[PDB]
Amino acid sequence: NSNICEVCNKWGRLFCCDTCPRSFHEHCHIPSVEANKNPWSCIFCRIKTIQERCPESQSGHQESEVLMRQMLPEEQLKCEFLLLKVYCDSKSCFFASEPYYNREGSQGPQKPMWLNKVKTSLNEQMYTRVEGFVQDMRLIFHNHKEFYREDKFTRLGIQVQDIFEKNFRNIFAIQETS
């Protein structure tokens, strides 16, 4: 197995996957690495299994259909993996914890949002449809773009949103378009 966490790329107290060489810190994995379970299979492995059991799940889908899906166990897992893929980028640090807003010439957002809040929301089964999760994820980057206006720091929101959207299209097998 790898000797660094797949998500944050640091060493430490690592839990190893039994079916692939990835390793994880306890709270870097989503969901947090389960207490017992031998063997244990990481979320990458669990997502690959879904795909293998239903090859047709990789045919193209419309976003509108995906968003209306109820959060049954497989869609819960897919949103957890998508959230983890965002954390895998180091620029996610900017969006992880609760933000605050005091900048001359800007007003803070009406509905602040952040990754750790989405994480808690998923853990507490607060989303009933994929749309709930995706709306909160997109709001993180929209709030950032609106608040930082012409500051070049706005680009960090564009960058991390792009990681989100690419992974959303991959995980949920959104139909490719130009």
State the residues that interact with Zn ion by CB under 5 A: 5, 7-8, 17, 20, 25, 28, 42, 44-45, 54
CB of 63 to Zn ion, least distance (A): 23
State both tokens at 167: 């992974």
Question: Which is closer to Zn ion, CB of 15 or CB of 172?
Answer: 15
Q: Can you tell me the distance from the alpha carbon of 158 to that of 162, in angstroms, rounded to the nearest whole number?
A: 6
Q: Can you tell me the distance from the alpha carbon of 30 to that of 78, in angstroms, rounded to the nearest whole number?
A: 11
Question: Which is closer to Zn ion, CB of 8 or CB of 139?
Answer: 8
CB of 51 to Zn ion, least distance (A): 11
Question: Which is closer to Zn ion, CB of 30 or CB of 134?
Answer: 30
Question: Which is closer to Zn ion, CB of 42 or CB of 137?
Answer: 42
CB of 85 to Zn ion, least distance (A): 14
CB of 132 to Zn ion, least distance (A): 26
Please, where are the H alpha helices in the chain?
A: 43-53, 63-68, 73-87, 93-96, 115-123, 130-148, 154-171
Question: In this structure, what is the dihedral angle of CA atoms 141, 142, 143, 149, given to the nearest 10 degrees?
Answer: 100
